[PDB]
């Protein structure tokens, strides 16, 4: 029951992800070095990771079918609101259940709760974020499902400042329908059971996560010296 257009969409999203997500993490050498010794010692390194990750997310978004039809202003508002959420989603691929940390192929680039804390973020974001990663990890999505969830997250009609809500909604619905149809046709029970609903529930968790991130960003960002450590893209996207 999976249409040719739907398989097309999946092929494109997979490729787009492959182009935007490097499982070697080779580019991490370019970031300011991580410092675990010290308040905000990880802030420069993780600010660079985030900023880099924002770029990669933008490049994935552009590849999504129908995203280009949207106005530039609509494209900007969608990316601005979703950026953090997609980064949290995409981060699942580095996240490991064994040690509860994000493992990027090296001990230096292996990030735990204390490293995140060293970035200036409270347990109020981090505890629910780790839970999110565990629950997402538990789902064991196919890669196809992962890429589709990211795309559906970016193209959301209810994001603040959207103008063409009717059009953003039409794009999303095609991707949602593609996902629903994929699970049914390609995803075997029992893992399939309630999988779409569970994935949609992850999008709601991401909104909460986003909201908290904003608050902690606003506090951290509010002091000038901490804001100095950030990148210019981070300042623009997350607000100056």
């Amino acid at each position: 029951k999976l249409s040719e257009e739907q398989q097309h969409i999946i092929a494109i999203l997979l490729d787009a992800h492959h182009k935007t997500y490097d499982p070697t993490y080779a580019d991490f050498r370019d970031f300011r070095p991580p410092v675990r010794m010290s308040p905000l010692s990880m802030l420069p390194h993780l600010a660079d990771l985030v900023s880099y990750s924002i770029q990669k997310v933008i490049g994935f978004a552009k590849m999504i079918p129908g995203f280009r039809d949207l106005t530039s202003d609509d494209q900007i508002v969608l990316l601005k609101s979703s950026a953090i959420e997609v980064i949290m989603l995409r981060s699942n691929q580095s996240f490991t259940m064994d040690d509860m940390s994000w493992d990027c192929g090296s001990q230096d680039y292996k990030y735990d709760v204390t490293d995140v804390s060293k970035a200036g973020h409270t347990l109020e974001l981090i505890e629910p974020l780790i839970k999110f990663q565990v629950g997402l990890k538990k789902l064991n999505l196919h890669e196809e499902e992962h890429v589709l969830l990211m795309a559906i997250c970016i193209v959301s009609p209810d994001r603040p400042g959207v103008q063409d809500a009717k059009l953003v909604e039409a794009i999303q619905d095609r991707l949602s329908n593609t996902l629903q149809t994929y699970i049914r046709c390609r995803h075997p029970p029992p893992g399939s059971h309630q999988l779409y609903a569970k994935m949609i529930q992850k999008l709601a968790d991401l909104r909460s996560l986003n909201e908290e991130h904003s608050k902690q960003y606003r506090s951290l960002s509010f002091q000038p010296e901490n804001s100095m450590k950030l990148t210019p893209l981070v300042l623009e996207v997350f607000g100056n």
């Binding site: 202003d73 494209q75 900007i76 990316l79 601005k80 210019p232 893209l233």
Partner: peptide, 11 residues
């Protein structure tokens, strides 16, 4: 709306 870097990357 004052997002030059984002607009450029988007383009």
């Amino acid at each position: 709306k004052n997002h030059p870097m984002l607009m450029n990357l988007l383009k």
